Amino acid sequence: MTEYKLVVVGADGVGKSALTIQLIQNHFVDEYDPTIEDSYRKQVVIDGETSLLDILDTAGQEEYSAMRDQYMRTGEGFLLVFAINNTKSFEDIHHYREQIKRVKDSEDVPMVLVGNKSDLPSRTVDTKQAQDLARSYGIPFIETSAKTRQGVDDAFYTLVREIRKHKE
Amino acid sequence: SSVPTKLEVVAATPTSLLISWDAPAVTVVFYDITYGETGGNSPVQEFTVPGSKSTATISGLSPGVDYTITVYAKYLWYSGYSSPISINYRT
Numbered sequence: 647m648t649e650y651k652l653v654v655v656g657a658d659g660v661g662k663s664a665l666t667i668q669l670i671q672n673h674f675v676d677e678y679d680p681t682i683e684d685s686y687r688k689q690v691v692i693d694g695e696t697s698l699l700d701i702l703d704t705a706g707q708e709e710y711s712a713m714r715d716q717y718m719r720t721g722e723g724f725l726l727v728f729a730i731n732n733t734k735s736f737e738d739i740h741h742y743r744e745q746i747k748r749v750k751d752s753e754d755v756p757m758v759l760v761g762n763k764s765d766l767p768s769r770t771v772d773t774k775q776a777q778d779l780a781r782s783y784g785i786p787f788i789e790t791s792a793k794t795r796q797g798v799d800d801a802f803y804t805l806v807r808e809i810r811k812h813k814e
Numbered sequence: 815s816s817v818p819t820k821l822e823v824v825a826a827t828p829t830s831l832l833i834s835w836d837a838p839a840v841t842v843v844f845y846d847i848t849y850g851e852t853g854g855n856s857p858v859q860e861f862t863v864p865g866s867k868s869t870a871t872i873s874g875l876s877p878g879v880d881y882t883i884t885v886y887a888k889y890l891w892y893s894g895y896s897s898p899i900s901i902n903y904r905t
């Protein structure tokens with residue numbers, strides 16, 4: 647059963663933890679308690695393939711270690727998350743794409759642009775802007791809300807499909 | 815070290831500065847650079863630099879003015895920012 651190492655990055659408070667909890671959270675006992683802080687495992691079925699998702703969250707600074715810094719760049723695919731009511735968070739997305747590519751020394755890194763908090767009335771970033779940016783990167787753009795669960799699954803599953811397309 | 819160190823003006827014109835610092839060990843997605851009159855009468859100006867650089871150009875300053883320049887590192891894999899390092903420079 648294929649594993650997929652997924653990393654969730656973006657500015658403070660855009661909802662990176664919220665989207666991950668909403669994707670994992672159910673009404674069972676949490677099937678895994680990973681001992682690596684801010685990691686999350688969950689099995690799913692995407693397009694038929696029964697897959698295990700190891701999801702690394704952006705950790706708090708109390709979790710810093712040189713090894714964690716190394717481990718995070720081995721992620722196979724990255725969610726670039728911004729909040730649609732937070733302009734700076736969208737304006738800094740390009741830094742995330744640029745530097746992830748740099749630290750992985752790779753020209754094709756599976757990536758999905760994620761615009762979150764789409765339930766909020768205080769929009770400051772236009773859907774068209776995010777679509778245009780995602781186009782220029784040749785990556786998908788998914789609009790999400792961790793509050794209403796809209797697009798949460800589509801975001802992570804699209805990232806898995808992109809990892810697949812990468813490995814052919 | 816988790817904080818950028820050794821912030822300095824490397825080169826200057828009467829109205830612009832080329833600043834340099836040393837990167838921290840923690841991986842940086844971008845540096846946040848702010849600059850303003852040391853007094854503080856006016857709001858600070860701010861821009862971002864890619865995490866792979868440790869220099870930047872500040873242009874459009876006023877000559878003979880005391881400026882406070884401040885650098886923050888935004889960690890790539892961790893929430894929040896480094897502590898700031900700052901310097902004063904008089905154009």
Ligand SMILES: Nc1nc2c(ncn2[C@@H]2O[C@H](COP(=O)(O)OP(=O)(O)O)[C@@H](O)[C@H]2O)c(=O)[nH]1
Pocket residue numbers: 657658659660661662663664665762763764765766790791792793794893
């Ligand atoms: N209305 C709304 N609030 C959200 C959404 N996602 C996160 N939040 C709230 O935004 C705040 C910060 O979210 P958090 O997941 O900690 O952001 P993180 O720092 O990126 O991990 C919390 O109060 C969340 O409850 C969303 O999609 N809609």
Ligand SMILES: [Mg+2]
Pocket residue numbers: 662663703704893
């Ligand atoms: Mg978080």
Ligand code: NA
Pocket residue numbers: 834835836837867868869
């Ligand atoms: Na430097």
